[PDB]
Amino acid sequence: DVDEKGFVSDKLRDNFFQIVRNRPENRTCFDCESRNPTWLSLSFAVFICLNCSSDHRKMGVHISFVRSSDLDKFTPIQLVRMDIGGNGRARNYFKQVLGVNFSPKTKEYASSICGRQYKQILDSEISE
Ligand SMILES: [Zn+2]
């Protein structure tokens, strides 16, 4: 099931993300709308492209904690987090709290207090 480092198998991971990536809102990158994104920020439970993933990787884990859904190891709780999150829930939250000019391309959401607040909404879902 789960290895000594606390990671699910590559196969369980594969079966999980193949489904969750196919959810319609998850089929375009959260930041730039590039199609079929396979990278992710665990923090906001959003899927992002290989291009936007590099930008996120320069920000630092407290801002955005980046993994490849294709390649990286995941713990079981990180899968649940991706499952209850997704691009649709995040877009919905941010368009409300950041408004009509919500512009995920700049990743302003990631460093924002609103970003922190959404990250905590997700923490609360997976913890209580
Ligand atoms: Zn992108």
PDB file of C-alpha atoms and ligand atoms in Angstrom:
ATOM      1  CA  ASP A   1       0.000   0.000   0.000  1.00  0.00           C
ATOM      2  CA  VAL A   2       2.411   2.686   1.367  1.00  0.00           C
ATOM      3  CA  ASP A   3       6.216   2.483   1.449  1.00  0.00           C
ATOM      4  CA  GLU A   4       8.524   3.233   4.419  1.00  0.00           C
ATOM      5  CA  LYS A   5       8.910   6.885   3.404  1.00  0.00           C
ATOM      6  CA  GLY A   6       5.096   7.163   3.593  1.00  0.00           C
ATOM      7  CA  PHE A   7       4.494   7.239  -0.188  1.00  0.00           C
ATOM      8  CA  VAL A   8       1.740   5.518  -2.175  1.00  0.00           C
ATOM      9  CA  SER A   9       2.872   3.227  -5.052  1.00  0.00           C
ATOM     10  CA  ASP A  10       3.525   4.731  -8.498  1.00  0.00           C
ATOM     11  CA  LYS A  11       0.539   2.734  -9.701  1.00  0.00           C
ATOM     12  CA  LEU A  12      -2.003   3.929  -7.122  1.00  0.00           C
ATOM     13  CA  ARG A  13      -0.721   7.454  -7.824  1.00  0.00           C
ATOM     14  CA  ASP A  14      -1.138   6.892 -11.571  1.00  0.00           C
ATOM     15  CA  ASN A  15      -4.689   5.561 -11.258  1.00  0.00           C
ATOM     16  CA  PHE A  16      -5.642   8.455  -8.929  1.00  0.00           C
ATOM     17  CA  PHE A  17      -4.204  11.327 -11.038  1.00  0.00           C
ATOM     18  CA  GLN A  18      -5.370   9.953 -14.385  1.00  0.00           C
ATOM     19  CA  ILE A  19      -8.918  10.389 -13.106  1.00  0.00           C
ATOM     20  CA  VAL A  20      -8.486  13.619 -11.213  1.00  0.00           C
ATOM     21  CA  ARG A  21      -6.634  15.275 -14.188  1.00  0.00           C
ATOM     22  CA  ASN A  22      -9.479  14.265 -16.519  1.00  0.00           C
ATOM     23  CA  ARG A  23     -11.993  16.346 -14.439  1.00  0.00           C
ATOM     24  CA  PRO A  24     -12.931  19.141 -16.910  1.00  0.00           C
ATOM     25  CA  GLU A  25     -11.700  22.108 -14.818  1.00  0.00           C
ATOM     26  CA  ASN A  26      -8.309  20.324 -14.338  1.00  0.00           C
ATOM     27  CA  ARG A  27      -7.685  20.062 -18.114  1.00  0.00           C
ATOM     28  CA  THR A  28      -6.321  23.547 -18.497  1.00  0.00           C
ATOM     29  CA  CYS A  29      -3.421  25.049 -16.422  1.00  0.00           C
ATOM     30  CA  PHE A  30      -4.644  27.122 -13.456  1.00  0.00           C
ATOM     31  CA  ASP A  31      -2.297  30.029 -14.367  1.00  0.00           C
ATOM     32  CA  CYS A  32      -2.167  30.174 -18.176  1.00  0.00           C
ATOM     33  CA  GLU A  33      -4.777  27.756 -19.552  1.00  0.00           C
ATOM     34  CA  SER A  34      -2.171  25.616 -21.455  1.00  0.00           C
ATOM     35  CA  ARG A  35      -3.936  22.311 -22.027  1.00  0.00           C
ATOM     36  CA  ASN A  36      -3.523  19.021 -20.103  1.00  0.00           C
ATOM     37  CA  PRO A  37      -1.420  20.326 -17.216  1.00  0.00           C
ATOM     38  CA  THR A  38       0.390  17.568 -15.287  1.00  0.00           C
ATOM     39  CA  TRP A  39       2.281  19.568 -12.678  1.00  0.00           C
ATOM     40  CA  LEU A  40       0.632  20.790  -9.485  1.00  0.00           C
ATOM     41  CA  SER A  41       0.845  23.160  -6.477  1.00  0.00           C
ATOM     42  CA  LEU A  42      -0.179  21.076  -3.468  1.00  0.00           C
ATOM     43  CA  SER A  43      -0.784  24.332  -1.492  1.00  0.00           C
ATOM     44  CA  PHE A  44      -3.817  25.374  -3.549  1.00  0.00           C
ATOM     45  CA  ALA A  45      -4.484  21.892  -4.949  1.00  0.00           C
ATOM     46  CA  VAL A  46      -4.277  23.297  -8.480  1.00  0.00           C
ATOM     47  CA  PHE A  47      -2.880  21.695 -11.677  1.00  0.00           C
ATOM     48  CA  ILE A  48      -0.410  23.804 -13.703  1.00  0.00           C
ATOM     49  CA  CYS A  49       1.761  23.298 -16.819  1.00  0.00           C
ATOM     50  CA  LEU A  50       5.492  22.588 -17.085  1.00  0.00           C
ATOM     51  CA  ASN A  51       6.048  26.297 -17.845  1.00  0.00           C
ATOM     52  CA  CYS A  52       4.074  27.630 -14.843  1.00  0.00           C
ATOM     53  CA  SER A  53       5.585  24.905 -12.617  1.00  0.00           C
ATOM     54  CA  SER A  54       9.068  26.459 -13.093  1.00  0.00           C
ATOM     55  CA  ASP A  55       7.817  29.874 -11.996  1.00  0.00           C
ATOM     56  CA  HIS A  56       6.175  28.307  -8.937  1.00  0.00           C
ATOM     57  CA  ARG A  57       9.378  26.379  -8.127  1.00  0.00           C
ATOM     58  CA  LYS A  58      11.241  29.723  -7.790  1.00  0.00           C
ATOM     59  CA  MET A  59       8.806  31.001  -5.152  1.00  0.00           C
ATOM     60  CA  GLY A  60       9.570  28.644  -2.245  1.00  0.00           C
ATOM     61  CA  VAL A  61       7.526  25.979  -0.549  1.00  0.00           C
ATOM     62  CA  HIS A  62       5.660  28.220   1.892  1.00  0.00           C
ATOM     63  CA  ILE A  63       4.262  30.095  -1.124  1.00  0.00           C
ATOM     64  CA  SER A  64       3.718  27.183  -3.539  1.00  0.00           C
ATOM     65  CA  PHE A  65       4.779  23.540  -3.039  1.00  0.00           C
ATOM     66  CA  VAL A  66       5.219  22.036  -6.476  1.00  0.00           C
ATOM     67  CA  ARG A  67       5.106  18.407  -7.672  1.00  0.00           C
ATOM     68  CA  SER A  68       4.778  16.571 -10.941  1.00  0.00           C
ATOM     69  CA  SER A  69       1.610  14.417 -10.867  1.00  0.00           C
ATOM     70  CA  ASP A  70       3.303  12.147 -13.437  1.00  0.00           C
ATOM     71  CA  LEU A  71       6.607  11.557 -11.800  1.00  0.00           C
ATOM     72  CA  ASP A  72       6.824  12.515  -8.119  1.00  0.00           C
ATOM     73  CA  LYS A  73       6.022  10.498  -4.971  1.00  0.00           C
ATOM     74  CA  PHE A  74       2.889  11.471  -2.960  1.00  0.00           C
ATOM     75  CA  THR A  75       1.600  10.658   0.556  1.00  0.00           C
ATOM     76  CA  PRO A  76      -2.007   9.441   0.871  1.00  0.00           C
ATOM     77  CA  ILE A  77      -3.199  12.708   2.491  1.00  0.00           C
ATOM     78  CA  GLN A  78      -1.757  14.722  -0.440  1.00  0.00           C
ATOM     79  CA  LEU A  79      -3.945  12.695  -2.805  1.00  0.00           C
ATOM     80  CA  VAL A  80      -7.050  13.435  -0.724  1.00  0.00           C
ATOM     81  CA  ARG A  81      -6.078  17.119  -0.829  1.00  0.00           C
ATOM     82  CA  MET A  82      -5.903  17.113  -4.620  1.00  0.00           C
ATOM     83  CA  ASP A  83      -9.227  15.248  -4.693  1.00  0.00           C
ATOM     84  CA  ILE A  84     -11.134  17.826  -2.569  1.00  0.00           C
ATOM     85  CA  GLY A  85      -9.430  20.738  -4.335  1.00  0.00           C
ATOM     86  CA  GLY A  86      -8.940  21.066  -8.090  1.00  0.00           C
ATOM     87  CA  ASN A  87      -8.844  23.991 -10.528  1.00  0.00           C
ATOM     88  CA  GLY A  88     -12.630  24.575 -10.386  1.00  0.00           C
ATOM     89  CA  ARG A  89     -12.909  25.016  -6.604  1.00  0.00           C
ATOM     90  CA  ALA A  90      -9.801  27.315  -6.615  1.00  0.00           C
ATOM     91  CA  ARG A  91     -11.028  29.413  -9.614  1.00  0.00           C
ATOM     92  CA  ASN A  92     -14.350  29.721  -7.811  1.00  0.00           C
ATOM     93  CA  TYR A  93     -12.774  30.880  -4.565  1.00  0.00           C
ATOM     94  CA  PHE A  94     -10.285  33.314  -6.201  1.00  0.00           C
ATOM     95  CA  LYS A  95     -12.752  34.904  -8.667  1.00  0.00           C
ATOM     96  CA  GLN A  96     -14.910  35.737  -5.572  1.00  0.00           C
ATOM     97  CA  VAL A  97     -12.162  36.986  -3.245  1.00  0.00           C
ATOM     98  CA  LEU A  98      -9.801  38.493  -5.879  1.00  0.00           C
ATOM     99  CA  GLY A  99     -12.737  39.631  -8.096  1.00  0.00           C
ATOM    100  CA  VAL A 100     -13.264  40.269 -11.846  1.00  0.00           C
ATOM    101  CA  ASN A 101      -9.563  40.992 -12.547  1.00  0.00           C
ATOM    102  CA  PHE A 102      -8.393  37.758 -10.993  1.00  0.00           C
ATOM    103  CA  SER A 103      -5.300  37.096 -13.042  1.00  0.00           C
ATOM    104  CA  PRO A 104      -3.625  33.772 -12.056  1.00  0.00           C
ATOM    105  CA  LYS A 105      -0.903  34.276 -14.676  1.00  0.00           C
ATOM    106  CA  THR A 106       0.975  36.609 -12.310  1.00  0.00           C
ATOM    107  CA  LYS A 107       0.655  34.172  -9.360  1.00  0.00           C
ATOM    108  CA  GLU A 108      -0.384  37.146  -7.172  1.00  0.00           C
ATOM    109  CA  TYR A 109      -2.944  34.718  -5.673  1.00  0.00           C
ATOM    110  CA  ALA A 110      -0.149  32.425  -4.418  1.00  0.00           C
ATOM    111  CA  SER A 111       1.546  35.113  -2.268  1.00  0.00           C
ATOM    112  CA  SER A 112      -1.691  36.813  -1.217  1.00  0.00           C
ATOM    113  CA  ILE A 113      -3.347  36.606   2.222  1.00  0.00           C
ATOM    114  CA  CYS A 114      -6.360  35.213   0.238  1.00  0.00           C
ATOM    115  CA  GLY A 115      -4.030  32.449  -0.974  1.00  0.00           C
ATOM    116  CA  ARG A 116      -3.061  31.674   2.626  1.00  0.00           C
ATOM    117  CA  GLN A 117      -6.751  31.658   3.614  1.00  0.00           C
ATOM    118  CA  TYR A 118      -7.695  29.231   0.793  1.00  0.00           C
ATOM    119  CA  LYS A 119      -4.740  26.945   1.714  1.00  0.00           C
ATOM    120  CA  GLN A 120      -6.229  26.828   5.274  1.00  0.00           C
ATOM    121  CA  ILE A 121      -9.742  26.023   3.943  1.00  0.00           C
ATOM    122  CA  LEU A 122      -8.227  22.986   2.278  1.00  0.00           C
ATOM    123  CA  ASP A 123      -6.195  22.055   5.426  1.00  0.00           C
ATOM    124  CA  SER A 124      -9.386  22.219   7.422  1.00  0.00           C
ATOM    125  CA  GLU A 125     -11.184  19.907   4.905  1.00  0.00           C
ATOM    126  CA  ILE A 126      -8.524  17.220   5.160  1.00  0.00           C
ATOM    127  CA  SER A 127      -8.060  17.499   8.968  1.00  0.00           C
ATOM    128  CA  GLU A 128     -11.412  18.172  10.695  1.00  0.00           C
TER     129      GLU A 128
HETATM  130 ZN    ZN B   1       0.648  27.438 -17.310  1.00  0.00          ZN
END
